[PDB]
Structure 1
Amino acid sequence: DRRRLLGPAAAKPMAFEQELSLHTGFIENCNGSALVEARSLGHQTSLITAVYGPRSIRGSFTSQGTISIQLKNGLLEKYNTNELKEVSSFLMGIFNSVVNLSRYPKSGIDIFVYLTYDKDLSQISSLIPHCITSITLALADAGIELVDMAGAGEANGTVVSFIKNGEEIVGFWKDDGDDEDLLECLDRCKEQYNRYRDLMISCLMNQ
């Protein structure tokens, strides 16, 4: 590789109570940033979300804004690049309802979400509600108008995102798990949403 330093190509790699921590506005490189850390049982997750925008696009005739989300692997190389694109597509399907696009014509908002540390003692399903929490904080910190606070929860691999105080749904992610958990997951994630919502609102007011 003439772009980076990959080293010797003839070598081989190595072969062998909910708690939240929220911090926003700690990056001066962008317009809005957020830090989300969650520790539960034997599984903790720490990720960082950066928001760059809204910045004008030359020649753009779009009467509304354009959101782009990309997930990255900060340290541990676990999640496939194909799967990262899938979640990104899912995340954009959420905030396109959340973000007031009519406010930013001829403009675009780029969202970078760095997945730093994730310990585990499906798989990426559990990180999804934390990514939504991070982005919604980073957007609100950046100054981007949001119609409502976006939040979600993970119950038996079934992720569902809520707005308008859980009355409606802005995203639904079902992978593996089992059946007939429709009513249960909707009630369990709604509790996680309300919990994540109040902590998100408190996070923006305090600092």
Structure 2
Amino acid sequence: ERPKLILDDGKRTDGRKPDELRSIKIELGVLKNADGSAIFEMGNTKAIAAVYGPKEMHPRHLSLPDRAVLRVRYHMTPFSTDERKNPAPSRREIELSKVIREALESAVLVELFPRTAIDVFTEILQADAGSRLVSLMAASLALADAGIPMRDLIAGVAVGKADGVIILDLNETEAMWGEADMPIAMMPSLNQVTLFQLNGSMTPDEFRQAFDLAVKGINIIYNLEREALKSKYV
């Protein structure tokens, strides 16, 4: 709304074309004590996740008789941001814990383990836009790394509009000053959307262009998640 988000050369503030992703880096089995672990970086957005494998949930009236219960935490460290975030969970963090959980719920073959809980803890170490998605993907990989069966991996990317241009994988500047910001996550092999939100505004047509660009970006990310996982064995 103030800075120029698309320059006269038609590129973005970080030099990317509108259809270009930030660089990605994945690491597996980083935490010795967790049943499953991962770090996912997407440009300057960094997340780590730990999974604690299916275990009988004590309550137990919180357990489910037919399936496992997912417990998930999205949380940002105080130094993950530009100004220090208070470590107490914000309304935003609470919402995102639920949105991320519900995304995983469609992936994780939970009925294999009734009366159990599976704990997914993700921390945002660096937040430069798209962290709910980076948190999601870390979680997905940590589950994979923990040997908890799943339908598919989850890949996700945010699309938006900035200065009227539909763009792929927004950096923080684009999120703050852009017109729309729309994170999308799927199980790509199954063509199923697991996370879908929009804030800002778009015409219905912009929404359809933006959505089509998101899928193409997600396929690239998905391939990466797949190699990352296969890497140590190959």
Normalization by structure 2: what TM-score?
A: 0.72
Aligned twin of 1:185 = 210
Aligned twin of 1:204 = 229
Where in structure 2 are there 5+ consecutive unaligned residues?
1-20, 161-180
Equivalent pairs counted in the alignment come to 182
**Is the contact made by 1:69 and 1:88 (CA closer than 8 Å) also made in structure 2?**
yes
Answering whether residue 47 of structure 2 is matched by residue 22 of structure 1, we say no
1:42-121 → structure 2 map (5 Å cutoff): 44-58=44-58, 59=60, 60=63, 62-74=65-77, 75-76=79-80, 77-78=84-85, 81-119=90-128
Tell me the SS of whatever aligns to 1:175: strand
Partner deviation per Cα, 1:45-65 (whole Å, 9 max, x = no partner): 111111112111244452101
**Is the contact made by 2:124 and 2:131 (CA closer than 8 Å) also made in structure 1?**
no
Between the aligned partners of 2:64 and 2:194, the Cα distance in structure 1 is 27
Of the structure 1 ranges 155-164 and 105-114, higher mean CA displacement relative to structure 2 is found in 155-164
Between the aligned partners of 2:64 and 2:109, the Cα distance in structure 1 is 17
Identical columns (%): 20
Aligned twin of 1:159 = 183
Given the superposition, is the C-alpha separation of residues 145 and 128 from structure 1 closer, same or farther in structure 2, using an over 3 Å criterion?
same
Partner deviation per Cα, 1:182-205 (whole Å, 9 max, x = no partner): 211221111121111111010111
Normalization by structure 1: what TM-score?
A: 0.81
Between the aligned partners of 2:133 and 2:209, the Cα distance in structure 1 is 17
CA positional deviation for 1:128: 2.3
Where in structure 1 are there 5+ consecutive unaligned residues?
1-16
What value does the CA root-mean-square deviation take over the aligned residues? 1.8
Between the aligned partners of 2:25 and 2:195, the Cα distance in structure 1 is 24
Large movers: runs of 4+ above 4 Å: none
Aligned twin of 1:36 = 40
**Is the contact made by 1:153 and 1:188 (CA closer than 8 Å) also made in structure 2?**
no
Answering whether residue 172 of structure 2 is matched by residue 141 of structure 1, we say no
CA positional deviation for 1:73: 2.2
Between the aligned partners of 1:73 and 1:184, the Cα distance in structure 2 is 31
